[PDB]
Amino acid sequence: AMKKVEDGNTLVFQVDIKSNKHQIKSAVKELYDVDALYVNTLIRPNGTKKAYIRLTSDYDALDIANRIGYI
Amino acid sequence: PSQKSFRTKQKLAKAQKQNRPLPQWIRLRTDNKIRYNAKRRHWRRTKLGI
Amino acid sequence: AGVKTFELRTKSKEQLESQLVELKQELATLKVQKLQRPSLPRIHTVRKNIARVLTVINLNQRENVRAFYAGKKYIPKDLRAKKTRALRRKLTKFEASQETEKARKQRIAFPQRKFAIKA
Amino acid sequence: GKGTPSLGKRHNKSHTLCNRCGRRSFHVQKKTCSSCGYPAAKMRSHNWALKAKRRRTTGTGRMAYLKHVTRRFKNGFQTGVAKAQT
RNA sequence: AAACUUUCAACAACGGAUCUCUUGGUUCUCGCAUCGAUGAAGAACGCAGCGAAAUGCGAUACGUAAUAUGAAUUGCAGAUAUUCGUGAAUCAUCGAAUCUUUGAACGCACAUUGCGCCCUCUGGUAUUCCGGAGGGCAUGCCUGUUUGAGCGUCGU
RNA sequence: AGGAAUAGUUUUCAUGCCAAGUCGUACUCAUAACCGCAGCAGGUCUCCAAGGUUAACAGCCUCUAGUUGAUAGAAUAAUGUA
RNA sequence: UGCUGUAAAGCUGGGUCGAACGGCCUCUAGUGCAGAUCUUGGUGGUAGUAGCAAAUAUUCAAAUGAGAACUUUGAAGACUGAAGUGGGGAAAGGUUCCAUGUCAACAGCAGUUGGACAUGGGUUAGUCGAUCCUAAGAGAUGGGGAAGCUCCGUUUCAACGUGCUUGAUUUUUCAGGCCAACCAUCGAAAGGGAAUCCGGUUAAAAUUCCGGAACUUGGAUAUGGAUUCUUCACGGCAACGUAACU
RNA sequence: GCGAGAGACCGAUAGCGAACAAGUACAGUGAUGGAAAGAUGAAAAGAACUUUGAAAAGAGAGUGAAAAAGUACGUGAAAUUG
RNA sequence: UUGGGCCCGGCUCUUGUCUAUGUUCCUUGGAACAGGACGUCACAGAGGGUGAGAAUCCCGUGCGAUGAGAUGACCCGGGUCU
Ligand SMILES: CN[C@@H]1[C@@H](O)[C@@H](O[C@@H]2[C@@H](O)[C@H](O[C@H]3O[C@H]([C@@H](C)O)[C@@H](O)[C@H](O)[C@H]3N)[C@@H](N)C[C@H]2N)OC[C@]1(C)O
Ligand SMILES: CN[C@@H]1[C@@H](O)[C@@H](O[C@@H]2[C@@H](O)[C@H](O[C@H]3O[C@H]([C@@H](C)O)[C@@H](O)[C@H](O)[C@H]3N)[C@@H](N)C[C@H]2N)OC[C@]1(C)O
């Protein structure tokens, strides 16, 4: 996941299994003040949902990840 | 199969979660009787019957 | 320990909602720190703080509606008394105590007397 | 060829999971559960099968509501809240 | 004569009898009457700082409030947790709540996490297109309201 | 039905603007991942298909790719099996 | 170790052991085993025996390791021989995938290896499917049977539209008009069906990611063009042509 | 069903199938079928340390009233075996 | 012969608080809850716990005492106004 952060400007999140791509886009906007170029989703083999969120070119995913606090 | 329903995949996820050995700190508790997980399952021996 | 319920009931609906936002932000922060410590008993406290604030908001609004429907003939079903299905079908005290005028006259005319023997 | 060779051709499920009871007794073509009788309004049961009644009956589940009726009856089906003492 | 075999004894095995027990069963008696559309019983899937079960619970998830009580919990760890006290622990008590997806199971459908429609609010330059939040739309029958149909029928 | 005189089209002509939800997606598919109680010589639907010989997609040899798995060692009576 | 009794049995010495138990007078019973191809559990002889022989076939050296016929690398000898022992899928399985560690049990020899065991990682779509359509068929509904669970009917003896279009009016009300033969619903991962390709990238995903280049549907809406004073375009004998062209 | 009190009852092959994570594990397409399994010690004091071994383990040592109690754990019969 | 509206009690139910007398000496034992001696309480010598058979160590048992609440046309005992 952090390789995708470093390269593709993509943030990787676990999300609620019931949420769709529109809700995830709005949620990252409201929580982190970033704009998603897209949201790719995935239900994992353990039953939880993973979202691959690529930010627009106006944002640097590494800076946002440092600010969120997990890098 | 690769093509599978949401219901099936949800059952398969729960089946993976229950197929783990005992957390070993359980055995240290006051008056503990469980020595191992007696409800293990191997994919080739016992089938899930979904 | 966390937030104290007797302190929460003094607050207004605006002060409760802003506190709920900050507890959720704090729980999100702890889950990020959960990825690399990775043991955070603090999370249990904040989870239960969110439960208490959510409880106090709900019981505040529930008492507003009870005051809104107080004395009304029809009130929402979740404010009506819930005893059991069969007990709610039972005749009310007024209905059960109804008497025909024929029966009332005879009851007044011949009440059970009070009496003893040996004198 | 009716034994081992014929046993090799078993890959079409007759039953799948039942929504009501969850057993894998929902017959695919009849759209009926052989265990609980879903989607009939009544649950399937027979007096010639008492052990089947034991397996799935009141008290084998959570009883999330009946659990507390006897305590609620014991207090006369109270309404209101408790009062602090002097 | 050894080896070998057979019998006994000792010790060691194999195995789990015997003896002692028992938060279980079984029978009898005494007392009580309380499930559900105000959504039951049952099902599925989740929830803990570290858990697979069992037990508890429902996105407020091994629980929230309240009442009582009065110093723990404990396998380890740990308060921005606590002790002459609005105070540790407590399914002690329990009258306030929460109560996912379902289920008689109720918008339609269901081997699908498929598809409508109505109202209020809200985002994208929007009564129509696309998105989000909240609230709604089953059947049989009763009483009533309203809007109607029939040269069935009265009067003018 | 609606449309001109200094005015409506028409997005079935060109260019430009916005958006596209949900679930599945790993891996095996078989002389060991399926069913035959098992890593069983059984059973289980289908697509792709090189050179030589030849009537031939048969048999026999070969290239790409893939395997070299199946308890092993020493001897070679009788009776077997092939 | 002995003693008593014809006997059923009773008592005692020594060892082991750790929490209750016996004589006598009576009461009571789920009260005495060698057998029932008895029941459950346990254990022998057989016996280190039958056997571990289909699918051409293995060998040298090094590395690793306590340990190598069986692991890895190199050399070689072979085979499948494209109707494969190759490369993919459907059904079914469900993490077996991948990396790291790892050998008690399992892999009917072995094991440093493994589909085993342990800890983690891993499945990204407007364009691929499902989803939608109907097929044989299944099946609600006014209803007609049946004591009833329910059976029958679906072109179903029925007052069966959650209708649609405009002129707009805001007043969220109207004004009309047009029809209602048919249409609950379910039924295909091989039938029908809107639209994506190439190159690159991982330990393990890719027509899904990255780079570049497109396409479809739904919507909005501006410019340019085209059309109209012969109002709703011209040309070609024609077949027909065109950027448009109520 | 809810709350109680009892017995000339059974005592882990008995007593309910279940005294235990029992309607569990497991089987069957399905209706259904359905086990086994209680006891170290008062207290884990669950054997530090040395030594042989690749290791599992052994030998010393140690704890305990007892190791003739070592999580293969109360006693520990018979068949069978050294 | 007389209806009705209410207050307090009783009864009924639920529930809080409170309670006698050895841990004296000797022996055995790892442990005294065993045996011996001397006692105590007893309307309490039921039962359980605690390092072995515990009335007297703990919880209870027996006996009472004293409070809080709820409910009752359809239970009754007195009072209040029409
Ligand atoms: C005397 N009573 C009769 C009553 O029996 C009934 O008649 C039915 C008639 O309606 C039916 O006929 C009807 O229904 C059939 C349907 C069954 O397929 C239709 O095909 C037909 O078009 C329709 N008219 C006829 N086939 C039988 C009569 N007994 O209805 C008509 C009536 C006069 O009331
Ligand atoms: C660790 N293995 C477990 C083990 O706990 C086992 O326990 C037995 C235990 O039941 C025996 O203990 C037994 O004690 C008596 C008597 C016969 O001894 C029995 O009546 C009783 O059923 C049983 N508790 C004990 N002596 C040996 C352990 N292996 O129980 C099953 C098992 C899987 O073998």
Ligand SMILES: [Zn+2]
């Ligand atoms: Zn069912």
